[PDB]
Structure formats: C-alpha cells, structure tokens
Amino acid sequence: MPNFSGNWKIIRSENFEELLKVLGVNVMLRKIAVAAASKYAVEIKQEGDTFYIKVSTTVYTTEINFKVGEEFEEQTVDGRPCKSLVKWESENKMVCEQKLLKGEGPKTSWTKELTNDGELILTMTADDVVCTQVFVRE
Template sequence: MGPLSQPFGSVDTPSLDPNYSFKGEFTKYTVIAVAAASKPAVEITQQGESLSIQTSTSVRTTYVSFTVGESFNETTVDGRPCTSFPKWETDRKITCEQTLQKGEGPETSWTRELTNDGQMILVTGDVVCTRVYERD
C-alpha cells in the first residue's frame, strides 16, 4: 500500500486526486479584509504527501511546507508559535488544527479545499474568514 492510500490514525485516507497543486489569485473574502492582505496570490506544490504553500501579498510573502498526516511547527497568522497537524478530510480538502506551544489565545485552524470549478477555498479559525482563489 503506497503513502497515498495508507490510513492516518483511525481515519482512512481517501483516494487522493494525484494533483493537489494549485496556483491562483484571491477573488473574494466573506468578511471585510485589511488593505495589507488584499489580492494575495497562492501557490501550492505537491510531491506525494508533502505540500508547500506560498502566499504573497504586496506587504509580505509567507511559505509553509509540511507532510499531510505529520505534525509540524509554524506560526499562526498573528505570530504565535504553534504545532500544526494537517490531515486529508477528502481527496480535495485538507484541514489543519493548530495548538499553541505556550500562552493562551483563541484556537486556530485552517481548511483548504479545491473545487471542481477551479477555485481554492481557504477557511480560517473559529471566527470564519473565507478566501476564494481562482486558478490561473
């Protein structure tokens, strides 16, 4: 059984679309966005279960690389160190729970889903902010 068909924990991994790669530009928010984050571009590259996500705005560029099913250290959007655990929810949707490494604050998470009509939908946190990106 290859890495794309092995279960993670007690949840079976879905049959994966072999191409989760995505490159596109932001098209809309479901909440009002700050000017600094307007029109971000995102690029996701995939090699097996390993994904790299680069998000660029006119103010900054962020980059994260991880393997689905393995925890990794990163920083929340507001700068708090956390441990993140990404997992496949479906063959087109990844969810990631983030646990703060120290201190208190709101729980954070994100979900990225590729749609059949060429969009990527990013949902972040309990106070939901949804970004929709159109494929280039």
C-alpha cells in the same frame, strides 16, 4: 494532473476583519490587513501528501513545507508560533488543527479545498468565527 499545485490569486475574502478582531488586532491594523488581503497570492506545489506553500502579499511572503499526517511548526494568522497537523477530510479537502507553542489564546484552525469547478477555498477559524477566502488559478 490537476491537484492543489498552482499559482492562485484571491477573488473573495469574507469575515477577515472579524477574525482579526477575535485575535485582538486593533481597528486601524485590521483595516490595513483587510486592504493588504486583496493582494493575497498563494503558490502551491503538491506531490502525494507532501506540500510546499508560499503565501504572499505586496510586502510580505512566507513558505511552509508539510506532510499530511506529520506535525510541523508554523504560526497563527496573527503570527503566534504554533504546532500544526494536517489531515485529509476528502479527496481535495484538508484540515489543520493548531496548538500554541507558548501562551494561551483562541482555538485556531484552517482548511484548504479544491472545488469541482476549479476554485481553491481557504477557511480560517478562530473560536466562533470563520474567514473564507476564494482563489482562482492565475
């Protein structure tokens, strides 16, 4: 039955540069990151409240495994290691709060939502700034 599980390809990306800006990424690298973001692909396998998620671009790929409700370790959009904890906000929306392992920096979080007409929306927040990325099934 249809859930988050699937192969997703990006079709829109709003506010990504502004998010990197907040994270201290210089202009040249942000522009390269924006260009790379248009090949974001996401693969999700979901069973119950257990998730496997592989995000990749042209040159880079990462995998995370988590269970809703259980702390896990990942990294921030700008690659700082963090501790993460995902909770449901509705049937097909989940929200993750992150805390830096070492250091200080902006407050980061992310969401994933399956909409009623079959999109996956990702949002990523750093302080006041919200990047939204929309995906459709491959």
